[PDB]
């Protein structure tokens, strides 16, 4: 059985590749930026999909399916894939593969919305989209084709639309923190980073300590009336006056899995939080030749049935052609959070040996105690994974006053929280300056595939105090808010 041999804290990229290949999460493909999602990864996607779909159904959002193609003139009302032929017959007008579906959906919204009684209109779809960039792709985190949901709502007032933006952003916080045990920071995107055409974009941002990079985990946009004006989406009040609708859109992708993998993995391979692990407990029988193997396997089956009564997801690995040691490594690499070992000694004592994946700590638990204690143990693992990741997030953010402090902090692979005047031009200049200083540094390093530019990640909702005369860290103008910056995906 393959072991992960790269160390997470020494060659992070090689570590990540080994962890996702050797655990059978991914397979490569002959078109660049496209990868195969194998069942071990797909199962985790199914779990978060089900969580989020159930939660938005409770909000009255209904699923739908809109075409994957969009006409040139509807899309252009650059990073798009264009279809131009069927067989060898040219199309009269090329058609694009969707990168996002506002321009596919909103002509229909304009047809469907007639009066205030048609609102709010709330739709979602689960599908894949294509964003054909040429920069370095990374499995799960940044790919040419990815799976996502996208929700699109329309409301009679801005207040109700904004309320929904924030309710969805809270569901994305729960997707990452409660399901995947990944801490995130809620905030607003800067004017240069917000969705094209929208009014205000909110985000949850995550952090990869090993390469210092922030990453946008999910996004929820107040489109306001901008798209309603573009698509003539209006409704009548009760006396017949026409008004524009107020819109949101929001989306979360398979990037989430990658974030999870990078957050919790260790030098042995994956560590999957128990709430989304497709196998929570793997039972490994010890099978000597000189034992009553039928009695040991019979007890493993009884324990499996007992655990499944508490809804624990259990597999018995009773393969005779591998040793227990081999199986220990096999399921460690795959990130199963609990292993249960049962041999003749255990049978005789009425106990089982349980080993937790995150710490390696082992417990002896009586069969009667097994189901409640495992449940307690899985909640403790989930909580411990989250708290440890949150401590690394906090340790990864430096509060600074002045631009002179930026390069030392980025050299420590940290994010910076700085007072900023929020001038869009300033962000563009900071990106270019940090980028050129990073190139110099790389040459002093004797070194390289992603950009060294520092950009804004999010103006966090939770704002530290801003003292009276605080200046912006780059311009010296009056600072308006604390903003989180870093290198990023
Ligand atoms: C897997 C994944 C995710 C996401 N993005 C975007 C923001 C967002 C968020 N939040 C979406 C709105 C929901 C997200 O997850 C984007 C992508 N590829 C790309 O940009 C294309 C690409 C390919 C190679 C290199 C550089 C760029 N690939
Ligand atoms: O691509 C985006 O960011 C928005 C949210 C999902 C639909 N379009
Ligand atoms: Cl479905």
CB 219 within 8 A of CB 256: no
Give me ligand 3 centre to Cα 256, in Å.
18
Distance CA 246, CA 156 (A): 6
CB 8 within 8 A of CB 14: no
CB 17 within 8 A of CB 141: no
Write out the DSSP string of 17-83: HHHHHHTTSEE--SSTT--EE-HHHHHHHHHHHHHHHHHHHHTT-EE----SEEEHHHHT-----EE
Q: Tokens 């978060």 — which residue? A: 48
Give me ligand 3 centre to Cα 275, in Å.
20
Does the Cβ of 125 fall within 6 Å of ligand 2?
A: no
Q: Residue 126 gets which letter from DSSP?
A: E
**What are the structure tokens assigned to 81, written together?**
């894939």
Q: Of 294, 313, 286, 285, which is closest to residue 371 (Cα–Cα)?
A: 313
**What are the structure tokens assigned to 310, written together?**
């508490």
Q: How far is CA 422 from the centre of its chain?
A: 27
Distance CA 473, CA 405 (A): 9
Name residues whose C-beta falls within 8 Å of residue 236's C-beta, 6 or more positions apart in sequence.
Answer: 114, 115, 116, 242, 243
Give me ligand 1 centre to Cα 343, in Å.
48
* Residues annotated in a binding site: 163, 167
Does the Cβ of 231 fall within 6 Å of ligand 2?
A: no
Distance CA 401, CA 382 (A): 36
Name residues whose C-beta falls within 8 Å of residue 257's C-beta, 6 or more positions apart in sequence.
Answer: 25, 41, 44, 45, 48, 140, 180
What residue owns the CA closest to ligand 1's atom 10?
A: 218
Q: Is the dihedral of CA 410, 411, 413, 416 positive or negative?
A: negative
Does the Cβ of 109 fall within 6 Å of ligand 2?
A: no
**Ligand 1 pocket, mutate which of 31, 176, 255, 261 (most atoms under 8 A from CB):** 255
Declared resolution, Å: 1.7
Phi and psi torsions of 60, nearest 5°: 85, 15
Q: Is the dihedral of CA 486, 26, 314, 172 positive or negative?
A: positive
Sheet holding 89-97, edge to edge: 69-71, 89-97, 82-86
Element (H, E) at 188: strand 185-188
Give me ligand 3 centre to Cα 464, in Å.
41
Which of the ligands is closest to the CA of residue 153? 2
Residue 226, CA distances (Å) to 190, 245, 430 in order: 18, 9, 29
Strand 89-97 and strand 145-155: pairing? unpaired
Which of the ligands is closest to the CA of residue 204? 1
* Interior angle at CA 272, CA 267 and CA 275, nearest 5: 160
HEC profile of 205-239: EEEECCCCEEEEEEEEEEEECHHHHHHCCEEECCC
CB 285 within 8 A of CB 350: no
Distance CA 459, CA 479 (A): 12
Q: Of 250, 195, 263, 199, which is closest to residue 226 (Cα–Cα)?
A: 199
Distance CA 40, CA 201 (A): 33
Element (H, E) at 166: helix 158-174
Nearest ligand 1 atom to alpha carbon 135: 25
What residue owns the CA closest to ligand 2's atom 5?
A: 250
Write out the DSSP string of 397-437: EEE-SSGGGHHHHHHTT-EEEEEE---HHHHHHHHHHHHHH
Nearest ligand 1 atom to alpha carbon 141: 1
CB 453 within 8 A of CB 438: yes
Nearest ligand 2 atom to alpha carbon 250: 5
**What are the structure tokens assigned to 261, written together?**
């993998």
3-state secondary structure of 455: strand
Q: How far is CA 211 from the centre of its chain?
A: 17
Give me ligand 1 centre to Cα 131, in Å.
7
* Interior angle at CA 405, CA 444 and CA 190, nearest 5: 105
Beta bridge partners of 236: 115, 242
Does the Cβ of 100 fall within 6 Å of ligand 1?
A: no
Give me ligand 1 centre to Cα 228, in Å.
25
Q: Tokens 């804290």 — which residue? A: 9
CB 113 within 8 A of CB 119: yes
CB 422 within 8 A of CB 482: no
What residue owns the CA closest to ligand 2's atom 7?
A: 150
**What are the structure tokens assigned to 115, written together?**
């009066």
Distance CA 82, CA 151 (A): 24
Give me ligand 3 centre to Cα 445, in Å.
49
CB 22 within 8 A of CB 1: no
Phi and psi torsions of 179, nearest 5°: -90, -50
Distance CA 1, CA 180 (A): 27
What residue owns the CA closest to ligand 2's atom 1?
A: 100
The length of the chain in residues reads 489
**Ligand 1 pocket, mutate which of 142, 194, 213 (most atoms under 8 A from CB):** 142
CB 125 within 8 A of CB 56: no
Does the Cβ of 216 fall within 6 Å of ligand 2?
A: no
Does the Cβ of 235 fall within 6 Å of ligand 1?
A: no
Distance CA 343, CA 285 (A): 6
Strand 281-285 and strand 314-316: pairing? parallel
3-state secondary structure of 186: strand
Distance CA 121, CA 62 (A): 9
Checking 30-33 for CB contacts under 8 A at 24+ apart, the result is 31/144, 32/137, 32/144, 33/132, 33/133, 33/137, 33/143, 33/144, 33/145
CB 165 within 8 A of CB 202: yes
Does the Cβ of 151 fall within 6 Å of ligand 2?
A: no
Q: Is the dihedral of CA 156, 162, 165, 167 positive or negative?
A: negative
* Interior angle at CA 67, CA 248 and CA 83, nearest 5: 115
Residue 106, CA distances (Å) to 85, 101, 196, 236 in order: 26, 8, 15, 18
CB 190 within 8 A of CB 203: no
Distance CA 146, CA 19 (A): 20
Distance CA 291, CA 288 (A): 6
Q: Of 197, 205, 206, 201, which is closest to residue 189 (Cα–Cα)?
A: 201
CB 483 within 8 A of CB 417: yes
Phi and psi torsions of 46, nearest 5°: -55, -40
Distance CA 158, CA 448 (A): 44
Does the Cβ of 195 fall within 6 Å of ligand 1?
A: no
Q: For the chain, give every domain's residue range.
A: 1-273, 274-379, 397-488
**What are the structure tokens assigned to 200, written together?**
């205000």
Q: How large is the C-alpha radius of gyration of the chain?
A: 26
Nearest ligand 1 atom to alpha carbon 255: 1
Q: Of 267, 249, 193, which is closest to residue 428 (Cα–Cα)?
A: 193
* Residues annotated in a binding site for Ca(2+): 163, 167
Cis ω for the linkage preceding 120 (within 30 of 0)? yes
Does the Cβ of 198 fall within 6 Å of ligand 1?
A: no
Which of the ligands is closest to the CA of residue 253? 1
CB 280 within 8 A of CB 337: yes
Write out the DSSP string of 359-405: T--EEEEETTTHHHHHHHHHHHHHHHHHHHHHHHHHHTEEE-SSGGG
């Amino acid at each position: 059985g393959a072991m992960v041999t790269a160390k997470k804290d020494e060659n992070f990229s090689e570590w990540y590749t080994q962890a996702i290949v050797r655990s059978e999460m991914i397979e490569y493909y002959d078109i660049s930026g496209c990868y195969i999602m194998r069942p071990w990864a797909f199962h985790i996607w199914e779990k978060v999909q089900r969580f989020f779909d159930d939660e938005i159904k409770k909000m009255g959002v209904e699923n739908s399916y809109f075409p994957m193609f969009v006409s040139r003139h509807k899309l252009e009302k650059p990073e798009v894939a264009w279809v131009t032929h069927y067989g060898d017959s040219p199309l009269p007008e090329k058609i694009a593969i969707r990168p996002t579906s506002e321009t596919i959906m909103y002509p229909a919204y304009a047809k469907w919305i007639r009066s205030h009684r048609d609102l709010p209109l709330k739709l979602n779809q689960w599908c894949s989209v294509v964003r054909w960039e040429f920069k370095q792709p990374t499995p799960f985190l940044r790919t040419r084709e990815f799976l996502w949901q996208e929700g699109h709502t329309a409301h009679a007032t801005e207040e109700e639309a904004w309320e929904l933006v924030l309710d969805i952003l809270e569901l994305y916080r729960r997707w990452y923190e409660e399901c995947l045990a990944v801490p995130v920071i809620k905030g607003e995107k800067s004017e240069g980073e917000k969705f094209a055409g929208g009014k205000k974009t909110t985000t949850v941002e995550a952090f990869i300590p090993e390469n210092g990079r922030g990453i946008q985990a999910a996004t929820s946009h107040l489109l306001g009336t901008n798209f309603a004006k573009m698509f003539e989406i209006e409704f009548e009040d009760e006396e017949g006056h026409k008004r524009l609708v107020h819109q949101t859109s929001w989306g979360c992708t398979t990037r989430s899995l990658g974030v999870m993998i990078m957050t919790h993995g260790d030098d042995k391979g994956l560590v999957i939080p128990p709430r989304v692990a497709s196998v929570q407990v793997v039972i490994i029988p010890i099978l000597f030749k000189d034992e009553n193997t039928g009695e040991i396997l019979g007890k493993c089956r009884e324990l499996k049935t007992m655990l499944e009564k508490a809804d624990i997801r259990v597999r018995i690995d009773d393969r005779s052609n591998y040793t227990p040691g081999w199986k220990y490594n096999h399921w460690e690499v795959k990130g199963v959070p609990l292993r249960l070992e049962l041999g003749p000694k255990d049978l005789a004592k009425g106990t089982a040996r349980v080993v937790r994946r995150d710490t390696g700590e082992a417990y002896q638990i009586s069969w009667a105690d097994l189901a409640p204690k495992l449940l307690e143990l899985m909640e403790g693992i989930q909580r411990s994974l989250f708290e440890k990741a949150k401590a690394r997030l906090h340790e990864g953010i430096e509060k600074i006053s002045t631009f002179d402090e930026v390069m030392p902090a980025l050299n420590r692979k940290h994010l910076v929280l700085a007072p900023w005047c929020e001038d869009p031009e300033s962000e563009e200049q900071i990106k270019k300056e940090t980028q050129k200083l990073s190139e110099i540094q790389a040459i002093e390093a004797g070194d390289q595939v992603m950009t060294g530019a520092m950009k804004t990640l999010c103006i966090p909702f939770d704002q530290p105090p801003m003292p009276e005369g605080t200046k912006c860290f780059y311009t010296g103008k009056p600072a308006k808010r604390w903003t989180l910056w870093g290198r990023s995906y």
